[PDB]
Amino acid sequence: LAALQKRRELKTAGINIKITTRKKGQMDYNADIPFEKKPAPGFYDTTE
Amino acid sequence: NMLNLLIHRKNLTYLHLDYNFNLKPVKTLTTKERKKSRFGNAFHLMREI
Amino acid sequence: VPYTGENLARPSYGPANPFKNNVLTGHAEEMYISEATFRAKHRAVEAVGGGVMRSNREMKEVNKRLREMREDKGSATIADGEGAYIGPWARYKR
Amino acid sequence: LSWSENIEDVEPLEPIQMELDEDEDAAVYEWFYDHQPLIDTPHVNGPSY
Amino acid sequence: DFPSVCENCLPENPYVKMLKEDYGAECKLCTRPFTVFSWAGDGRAHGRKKRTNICLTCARLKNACQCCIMDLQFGLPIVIRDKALELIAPGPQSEINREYFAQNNERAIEEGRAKTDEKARELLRRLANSKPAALPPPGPKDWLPPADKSIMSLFITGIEDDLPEWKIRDFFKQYGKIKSLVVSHMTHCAFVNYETREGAEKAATELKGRAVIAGCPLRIRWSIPRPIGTMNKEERAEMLRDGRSAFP
Amino acid sequence: IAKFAQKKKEWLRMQRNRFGEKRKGGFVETQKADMPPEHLRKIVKDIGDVSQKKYTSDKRSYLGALKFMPHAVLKLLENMPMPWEAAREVKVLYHVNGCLT
Amino acid sequence: RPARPQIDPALVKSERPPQTGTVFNIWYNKWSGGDREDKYLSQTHAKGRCNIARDSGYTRADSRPGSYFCLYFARGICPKGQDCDYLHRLPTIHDIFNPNVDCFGRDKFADYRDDMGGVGSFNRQNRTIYVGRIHVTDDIEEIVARHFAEWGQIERIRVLNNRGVAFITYTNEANAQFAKEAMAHQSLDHNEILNVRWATADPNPLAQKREQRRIEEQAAEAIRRALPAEFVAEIEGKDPEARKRRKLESSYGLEGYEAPDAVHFARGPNAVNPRG
Amino acid sequence: SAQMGNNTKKQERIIKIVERQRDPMEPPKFKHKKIPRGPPSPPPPVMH
Amino acid sequence: KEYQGRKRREFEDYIRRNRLRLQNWFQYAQWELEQKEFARARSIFERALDVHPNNTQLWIRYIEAELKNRNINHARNLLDRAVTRLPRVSKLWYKYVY
Amino acid sequence: MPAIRPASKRKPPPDGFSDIEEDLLIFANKMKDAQNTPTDNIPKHQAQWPIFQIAHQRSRYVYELYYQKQAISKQLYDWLLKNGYADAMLIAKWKKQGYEKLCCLRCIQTKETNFNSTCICRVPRAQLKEDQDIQCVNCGCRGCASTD
RNA sequence: AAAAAAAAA
Numbered sequence A: 001l002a003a004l005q006k007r008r009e010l011k012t013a014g015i016n017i018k019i020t021t022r023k024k025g026q027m028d029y030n031a032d033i034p035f036e037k038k039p040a041p042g043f044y045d046t047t048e
Numbered sequence B: 001n002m003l004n005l006l007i008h009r010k011n012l013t014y015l016h017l018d019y020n021f022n023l024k025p026v027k028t029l030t031t032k033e034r035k036k037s038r039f040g041n042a043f044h045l046m047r048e049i
Numbered sequence C: 001v002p003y004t005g006e007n008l009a010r011p012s013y014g015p016a017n018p019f020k021n022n023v024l025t026g027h028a029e030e031m032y033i034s035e036a037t038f039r040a041k042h043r044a045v046e047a048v049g050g051g052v053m054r055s056n057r058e059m060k061e062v063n064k065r066l067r068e069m070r071e072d073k074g075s076a077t078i079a080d081g082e083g084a085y086i087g088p089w090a091r092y093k094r
Numbered sequence D: 001l002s003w004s005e006n007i008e009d010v011e012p013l014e015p016i017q018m019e020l021d022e023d024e025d026a027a028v029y030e031w032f033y034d035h036q037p038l039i040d041t042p043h044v045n046g047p048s049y
Numbered sequence E: 001d002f003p004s005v006c007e008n009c010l011p012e013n014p015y016v017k018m019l020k021e022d023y024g025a026e027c028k029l030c031t032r033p034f035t036v037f038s039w040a041g042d043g044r045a046h047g048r049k050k051r052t053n054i055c056l057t058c059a060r061l062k063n064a065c066q067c068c069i070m071d072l073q074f075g076l077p078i079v080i081r082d083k084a085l086e087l088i089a090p091g092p093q094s095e096i097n098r099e100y101f102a103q104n105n106e107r108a109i110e111e112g113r114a115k116t117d118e119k120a121r122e123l124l125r126r127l128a129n130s131k132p133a134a135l136p137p138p139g140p141k142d143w144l145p146p147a148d149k150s151i152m153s154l155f156i157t158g159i160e161d162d163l164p165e166w167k168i169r170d171f172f173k174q175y176g177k178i179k180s181l182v183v184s185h186m187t188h189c190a191f192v193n194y195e196t197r198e199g200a201e202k203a204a205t206e207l208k209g210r211a212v213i214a215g216c217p218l219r220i221r222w223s224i225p226r227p228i229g230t231m232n233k234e235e236r237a238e239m240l241r242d243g244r245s246a247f248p
Numbered sequence F: 001i002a003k004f005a006q007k008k009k010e011w012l013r014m015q016r017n018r019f020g021e022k023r024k025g026g027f028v029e030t031q032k033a034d035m036p037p038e039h040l041r042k043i044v045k046d047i048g049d050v051s052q053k054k055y056t057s058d059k060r061s062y063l064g065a066l067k068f069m070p071h072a073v074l075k076l077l078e079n080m081p082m083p084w085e086a087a088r089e090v091k092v093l094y095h096v097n098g099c100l101t
Numbered sequence G: 001r002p003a004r005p006q007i008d009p010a011l012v013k014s015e016r017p018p019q020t021g022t023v024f025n026i027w028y029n030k031w032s033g034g035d036r037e038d039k040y041l042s043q044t045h046a047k048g049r050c051n052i053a054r055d056s057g058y059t060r061a062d063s064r065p066g067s068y069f070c071l072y073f074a075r076g077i078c079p080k081g082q083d084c085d086y087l088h089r090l091p092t093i094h095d096i097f098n099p100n101v102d103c104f105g106r107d108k109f110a111d112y113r114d115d116m117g118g119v120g121s122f123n124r125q126n127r128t129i130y131v132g133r134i135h136v137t138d139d140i141e142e143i144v145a146r147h148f149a150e151w152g153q154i155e156r157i158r159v160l161n162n163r164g165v166a167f168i169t170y171t172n173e174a175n176a177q178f179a180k181e182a183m184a185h186q187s188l189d190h191n192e193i194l195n196v197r198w199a200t201a202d203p204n205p206l207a208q209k210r211e212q213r214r215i216e217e218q219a220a221e222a223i224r225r226a227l228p229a230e231f232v233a234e235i236e237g238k239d240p241e242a243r244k245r246r247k248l249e250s251s252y253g254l255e256g257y258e259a260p261d262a263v264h265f266a267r268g269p270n271a272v273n274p275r276g
Numbered sequence H: 001s002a003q004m005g006n007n008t009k010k011q012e013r014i015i016k017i018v019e020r021q022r023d024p025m026e027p028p029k030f031k032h033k034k035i036p037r038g039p040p041s042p043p044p045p046v047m048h
Numbered sequence I: 001k002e003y004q005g006r007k008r009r010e011f012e013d014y015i016r017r018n019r020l021r022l023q024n025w026f027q028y029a030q031w032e033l034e035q036k037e038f039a040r041a042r043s044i045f046e047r048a049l050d051v052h053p054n055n056t057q058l059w060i061r062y063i064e065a066e067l068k069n070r071n072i073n074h075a076r077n078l079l080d081r082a083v084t085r086l087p088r089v090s091k092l093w094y095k096y097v098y
Numbered sequence J: 001m002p003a004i005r006p007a008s009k010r011k012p013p014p015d016g017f018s019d020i021e022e023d024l025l026i027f028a029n030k031m032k033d034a035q036n037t038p039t040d041n042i043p044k045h046q047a048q049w050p051i052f053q054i055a056h057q058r059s060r061y062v063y064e065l066y067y068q069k070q071a072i073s074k075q076l077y078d079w080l081l082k083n084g085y086a087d088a089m090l091i092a093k094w095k096k097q098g099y100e101k102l103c104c105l106r107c108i109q110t111k112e113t114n115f116n117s118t119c120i121c122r123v124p125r126a127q128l129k130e131d132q133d134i135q136c137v138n139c140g141c142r143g144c145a146s147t148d
Numbered sequence K: 001a002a003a004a005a006a007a008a009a
Ligand SMILES: [Zn+2]
Pocket: E027, E028, E029, E030, E031, E032, E054, E055, E057, E058, E059, E102
């Protein structure tokens, strides 16, 4: 909460710095769907 | 030069290997430095040979 | 055997689809040929002046002329200085 | 030590050799302390020794 | 046991000499070690040995040449293909997900289990029918040289997004040596500064406040240069129709 | 017969370049020879201790030749000069990076 | 004219970097020891600037088609000139390279870095470079325009003077990379060290829309080159002659048929079409 | 087969593939990686 | 995005710690549904089905999670797959007829 | 023996050795200077090039003095070959036909190239492209075919 | 005729 408050106070101050959230040995689950397993197609179209 | 490259590849540059093949730390080691630096019987047997 | 020559010499009936390789880009099957044949065809397509056959003597004077285009190789009995040996390492007049 | 700057042209010292008698040891006098003795003679099969 | 390489890449000679190395490099896409096939070139000037760069799994799934990594059908860079023809195969690109996806695809293909031109035609149909008080004309005051010699910027109004900068620079370099040219596309404004004031004067006399560049009508005036801020879109359309009014 | 003269030359050349008793394998094969000692001298002088960035391609191999260094120690100490020899010369097989002798 | 060597060979060699540490790691070739935070804030000015007007010229690669450019010419540090194995000249709009490589003959990665710098990525067609660390003045647009018209052929030159950061969108991959590696830590009029990275995609919906439209027009250009012009005209549906040609050709008698696209617009060895 | 554009000079090709003379002293080129196990082959019906 | 990164990291950590507890998969998929991330929710349910293929509760949860969001064609594919996988489970057949 | 003996274990060299040992000493000093050349300027592999040059030159020198003009005796020539004053295998290649201008032995070792070939320097000009800057990676020569 | 055994912004 303290870091979030400081971040929103500095973002509205004009300055914008992104910080490295990419620790080694761990995965970024937001870059793409982790270990994607798409649903199998059945007899019904699902495009729409 | 082979043993020197092995030492420097493991980022153990705080160990000096001299030209008579003695491995000595250049400074006082932390616990993590000592744990990472402990070499094996292959390195040490080759170094004494 | 799948008969002799009658079923090898006939077309399959019906029209084709109005709508088999193995590689994506094309088809490739292994083969055995003599390495000398491959070297001969590679040297034919690779070497400049390919084809355009010439007899031996004109090859002799074109090689002599290209030798004159190169600088002098040297005397090779002089160790150091002017007239020394350079041999194959002689540069080219361009 | 580099070979070129330190040992390449330096004349070596006298090795440990025994004063062979010329008359008594005349059979081995001319070849006793060669590196591979009798290598260019009909006493061996050839340079493979 | 044979690369999928287009004729653009296989050098010239139908008789080609090719080297093979097992686990010779990591795939540039899926980062897994694969068999590298490296051949020669059409010149013995740099022995680069143009080689494969992606594995046959990544070659087959994204359907591209192994060396140059462009499409086998159309010859597009593969992102251009997957973004314009759309869908087909996004493909994960992260750290562990990348080798996970490649591992599962290779495991499926080894175990047996498994319409581009149709989407090309549909792309053609999306693109064929696609579509992205007036000011007086420029008189004598807009191009007459004033008493001040520091007035150097040529203010040009009416430059659209369809107008590239190189046509402007090539059309103005015949008048003189251009010191600079800056164009604000969000404002549709242009400042042209010449290294020679004489060349700017010749351009002013030649163009006389009006220009037709690539079907684009532009109005040219003399002004002191200014920086351009976050200018409004309504005044942008005002300035556009002023540039249109330069050509009656 | 002058019409069939290029044919004779190309047929004889093809037959020799395929069945000649020097090309039993497609290429003229020789016996591997001895380099000058100064080649190895220059290589070992150039690489030094491997501290220049020029030899970054030679580092993996050099550290990998660590595996065969025991065997080099054996051959070196085996071929040592005896007390009656002021010097001895030995044939060495050396790696062209200078990694192993 | 022949290519001019820029620096004498006596200045450039393979020297060890400055001693920013206590012991030199000879595997990684880096000065280990000491602080690690000081290296992260240690940018330096370049050791020379190239100018194409007085230094470009003929070399061995100019006579060789299908060559690569000289990266050490772009930084103005190539010390041999005419006898360099790579090109010494600005790329044109016809100097098109494959996606696997950049214009300098270096392998081109699948994703960018943390600091968005280096060679590039073949996972995104990027003609736009970020040019930051610009001293704030009133005429930033003029100096950026001249110093980037020096290095090729521009399409967009967004500049934000309020904090002084520029976005320069060229027209070619080769010109973009040449401008990126030519101005790397190169000086402006003020004595500063520029930060020329690759540029992250703009969130401006217009820029996204026009970059998309560039992608579909490039794909359309390649498809129209690949397909027969008769097929392109007959599918295009703007010429009434093309429409009635389409009806009559994809009738084959049997009025009111209008054959499917998978059969009418089919290319094959036998096919049912004029083909080509 | 057909390709990106058209054909130019010759179609059929003769290719000589030889293994590359690798340095005997080189260690393995690439570090091995820890990847989670893939999904199973699709399960069968439960025929109870 | 940062909050979703935290929640995804925590949920995937607990998936990796105990993959046989169904509550981890259920809470992760429910949370991703509440974020209106439908592809991710489908992925989580499909991976849970990889770990627990013959679980009737998981099948019903994934069918109902796709029925509450009006994905009728998706849910009918799911029901065909469910009564194909588990032909002798009366609840799945009842749910499909209902 | 080609090794080094102290002072009195050295046998005398054969007759006529002074008039040629002047030039032999020139070649030895040239080889030492080639050992001492900077390598920071030229590429990495080109640093090996001068050695072979001098080696060829040294060998070729001895070759002429025994074969074209008979200026040294067979005792002196065989002594020169045995104590490493001239490459014996290179001269043995030079005496054969089609190999009279051979740069070095590594440029005909077809078992150490990728596709089992000699180097490109062993190819005549008339089949190589005009104005081609050929310079071999082994020794750095530009052409070794006997025609050239 | 070494290890246990001397701690994670
Ligand atoms: Zn791959």
